[PDB]
Amino acid sequence: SSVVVDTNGQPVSNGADAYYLVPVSHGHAGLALAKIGNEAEPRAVVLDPHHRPGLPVRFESPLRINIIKESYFLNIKFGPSSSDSGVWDVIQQDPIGLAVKVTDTKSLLGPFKVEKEGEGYKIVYYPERGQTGLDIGLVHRNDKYYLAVKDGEPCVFKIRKAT
Numbered sequence: 001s002s003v004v005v006d007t008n009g010q011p012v013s014n015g016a017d018a019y020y021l022v023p024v025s026h027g028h029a030g031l032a033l034a035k036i037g038n039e040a041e042p043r044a045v046v047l048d049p050h051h052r053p054g055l056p057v058r059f060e061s062p063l064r065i066n067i068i069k070e071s072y073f074l075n076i077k078f079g080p081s082s083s084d085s086g087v088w089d090v091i092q093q094d095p096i097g098l099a100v101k102v103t104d105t106k107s108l109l110g111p112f113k114v115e116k117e118g119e120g121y122k123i124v125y126y127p128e129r130g131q132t133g134l135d136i137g138l139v140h141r142n143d144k145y146y147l148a149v150k151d152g153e154p155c156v157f158k159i160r161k162a163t
Helices: none
Strands: 019-023 030-034 044-048 057-060 075-078 087-093 097-103 112-117 120-125 134-141 144-149 157-161
Touching: 019 030, 019 057, 030 144, 097 134
Parallel strands: none
Antiparallel strands: 019 157, 030 044, 044 097, 044 144, 057 075, 075 087, 087 097, 097 144, 112 120, 120 134, 120 157, 134 144
């Protein structure tokens, strides 16, 4: 499968560089952490008009290669490669369904792939590595756009090297 490219047409690096996920619609918005309702710490990933560019991410595969392809299962995380926190996971959370949230552990192979969609890319979540995955889209609740499983309604991004 194809090499994933940033907004300058360069291969997206495996962990070494961070990237903004820039929505192609939803006007201007960037990635942020929010509370869902009641939790003490904001750990739900949202797209927030008030946080542009937002929190950049790193895409990680345990394969030896220094670039990412659309075929690779990925961990995606906020923060440095060295830090255990910021790792995205998909969690059952009552208002949202299956919400994208940050965690501080990480499996050998991550839950996600980055796949070509429209003018850019979508994030796809894989309950099971040998089966079709489920598009990540946006769930609007409580004055926030939560990144959440919403198959058929993917949020489309371009990937801008945080440089």
